[PDB]
Design an enzyme around this catalytic site. Structure first.
Site, short mmCIF file in Angstrom:
data_model
loop_
_atom_site.label_atom_id
_atom_site.label_comp_id
_atom_site.label_asym_id
_atom_site.label_seq_id
_atom_site.Cartn_x
_atom_site.Cartn_y
_atom_site.Cartn_z
N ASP A 144 -28.94 -18.88 -5.45
CA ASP A 144 -29.39 -20.02 -6.24
C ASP A 144 -30.77 -20.60 -5.68
O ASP A 144 -32.12 -19.69 -6.09
CB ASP A 144 -28.43 -20.44 -6.02
N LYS A 182 -20.32 -20.41 5.67
CA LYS A 182 -19.16 -19.81 5.47
C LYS A 182 -18.74 -18.22 5.06
O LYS A 182 -18.22 -17.50 5.15
CB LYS A 182 -17.82 -20.44 5.45
N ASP A 202 -24.04 -14.61 0.48
CA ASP A 202 -23.17 -14.40 -0.63
C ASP A 202 -24.26 -14.19 -1.51
O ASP A 202 -23.98 -13.50 -2.69
CB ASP A 202 -21.85 -15.54 -0.39
N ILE A 203 -24.78 -15.34 -1.63
CA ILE A 203 -25.47 -16.33 -3.14
C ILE A 203 -26.79 -16.31 -2.67
O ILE A 203 -26.61 -17.12 -1.62
CB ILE A 203 -24.63 -16.88 -3.58
N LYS A 250 -29.00 -16.03 -8.34
CA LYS A 250 -28.55 -16.51 -9.15
C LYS A 250 -30.72 -16.47 -9.57
O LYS A 250 -31.03 -18.07 -9.67
CB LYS A 250 -27.86 -17.32 -9.18
O1 LIG Z 1 -29.85 -20.80 -2.51
P1 LIG Z 1 -28.54 -21.72 -2.69
O2 LIG Z 1 -28.84 -22.72 -3.40
O3 LIG Z 1 -28.76 -22.66 -1.29
O4 LIG Z 1 -26.91 -21.43 -2.69
C1 LIG Z 1 -26.39 -20.57 -1.94
C2 LIG Z 1 -25.44 -21.25 -0.90
O5 LIG Z 1 -24.76 -21.99 -0.65
C3 LIG Z 1 -23.91 -22.11 -0.52
O6 LIG Z 1 -23.39 -22.14 0.86
P2 LIG Z 1 -22.00 -23.73 1.14
O7 LIG Z 1 -23.52 -25.01 1.35
O8 LIG Z 1 -21.66 -24.00 -0.13
O9 LIG Z 1 -21.88 -23.28 2.24
P3 LIG Z 1 -21.02 -22.28 2.38
O10 LIG Z 1 -20.62 -21.08 2.54
O11 LIG Z 1 -19.87 -22.42 3.33
O12 LIG Z 1 -19.51 -22.17 0.86
C4 LIG Z 1 -23.42 -20.23 -0.06
O13 LIG Z 1 -22.64 -19.84 0.04
C5 LIG Z 1 -25.09 -19.97 0.12
O14 LIG Z 1 -25.34 -19.78 1.43
O1 LIG Z 2 -22.17 -20.24 -8.25
C1 LIG Z 2 -21.73 -20.32 -6.76
N1 LIG Z 2 -20.58 -20.23 -6.58
C2 LIG Z 2 -20.09 -20.70 -4.98
N2 LIG Z 2 -21.65 -21.19 -4.64
C3 LIG Z 2 -22.67 -21.03 -5.08
C4 LIG Z 2 -23.48 -21.61 -3.87
N3 LIG Z 2 -24.80 -21.88 -5.27
N4 LIG Z 2 -24.37 -21.10 -6.33
C5 LIG Z 2 -22.78 -21.05 -6.32
MG LIG Z 3 -22.81 -20.10 2.60
#
Ligand SMILES: O=P(O)(O)OC[C@H]1O[C@H](OP(=O)(O)OP(=O)(O)O)[C@H](O)[C@@H]1O
Ligand SMILES: Oc1ncnc2cn[nH]c12
Ligand SMILES: [Mg+2]
Ligand SMILES: O=P(O)(O)OC[C@H]1O[C@H](OP(=O)(O)OP(=O)(O)O)[C@H](O)[C@@H]1O
Ligand SMILES: Oc1ncnc2cn[nH]c12
Ligand SMILES: [Mg+2]
Ligand SMILES: [Mg+2]
Ligand SMILES: [Mn+2]
Lengths: 186, 196
Positions: A111, A48, A108-109, A139
């Protein structure tokens, strides 16, 4: 912003950086013959969190006259500790086939990169003309599997960020800015 | 901006921004008595993909400006496909991740025309017993109804012409435009021809 311990980027700073990355992307495809209907740049927005970044990015790409095709995908975990390869259940996938198209995964991110690395390989096996990723925040030291994003708006340290699509317990996605969640709140 | 494929611009980006701000303010005032609070009582925004993605992104930020805490739910519903007219059938491609039972829910849509999509969605969600169910639509073609439907919030009423931009598409094209414009029929007719 009482739940925050620090401001990383304001809406204005984010806005500017996205514009720069979009110009880079546009220049990078300036010879790929992108055209609407037949040859658009396919953006695979990972739900999302990327919803906000994608809305602003596609508009910046439009500024550079890059014809885009928006796709939104929804993924789900299979269970706890079931995979390590970042395998995820596909609840919603692309509407059109990407085979033979220039594709850009929007996140969006990144990690650990487990899920994103998985998705990248998956789409790669569908034979798009090209496949790259654009991620707002990176990150870099968080990797659990090697993975490099082609375009990144900003590199950040291991802090828990929220805002601009990013959440903590499905809260704060709506902030116009990106901030660091106070560990007292988390 | 000049769009070769546009008959004219209906609303500029600035115009949309101004109108969304006013609607968000009204939503804030209207939900004041519900005591919305993060974690425990957010206003659940049900974003109808794909069209609603841009409006949703800008609206949740405008709501945040007025301290309205929200929780986003993204669903995907299909009806027009690559064409210009309602298929007459509404397909649910992705439903909510969580139950809306007992929560304050606001469906966020880009446009209401024949109202078959919203009628389908409303009738589906109403049976789930949310604490309240309202709808905010960016655009309303009030004279396109095939089934009756009145949204709680309307950013703008529009004439019956095919509009694109700001999330709205014609064959999954033009959703990225910053402004809402009228697509020239010669453009969609040629594409419909090519597709046919
Ligand atoms: O590289 P990683 O350690 O996977 O971290 C990043 C992912 O985790 C989060 O998604 P989340 O599972 O929180 O779903 P969301 O986007 O719906 O919040 C973020 O939005 C990325 O998709
Ligand atoms: O810092 C961060 N904030 C929100 N979602 C994520 C996933 N990985 N790292 C995060
Ligand atoms: Mg996500
Ligand atoms: O009132 P109606 O006549 O039902 O028309 C309105 C619906 O049709 C369009 O969706 P579409 O089916 O084209 O899906 P999309 O959002 O992915 O573009 C539009 O975004 C509304 O959801
Ligand atoms: O004008 C229009 N543009 C985009 N989608 C729809 C649906 N109904 N009417 C539309
Ligand atoms: Mg998250
Ligand atoms: Mg459509
Ligand atoms: Mn729609």
């Amino acid at each position: 912003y009482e739940f925050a311990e620090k401001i990383l980027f304001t809406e204005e700073e984010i806005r500017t950086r996205i514009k720069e990355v979009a110009k880079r992307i546009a220049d990078d495809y300036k010879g790929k013959g992108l055209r609407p209907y037949v040859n658009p740049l396919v953006l695979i927005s990972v739900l999302k969190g990327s919803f906000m970044f994608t809305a602003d990015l596609c508009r910046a790409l439009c500024d550079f006259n890059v014809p885009v095709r928006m796709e939104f995908i929804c993924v789900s975990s299979y269970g706890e500790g079931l995979t390590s390869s970042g395998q995820v259940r596909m609840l919603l996938d692309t509407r059109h086939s990407i085979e033979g198209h220039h594709v850009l995964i929007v996140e969006d991110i990144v990690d650990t990169a487990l899920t994103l690395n998985y998705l990248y390989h998956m789409y790669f096996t569908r034979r798009p003309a090209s496949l790259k990723t654009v991620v707002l925040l990176d990150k870099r030291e968080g990797r659990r599997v090697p993975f490099s994003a082609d375009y990144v708006v900003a590199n950040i340290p291991n802090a828990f960020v929220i805002g601009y699509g990013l959440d903590y317990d499905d809260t704060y996605r709506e902030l116009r800015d990106i901030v660091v969640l106070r560990p007292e709140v988390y």
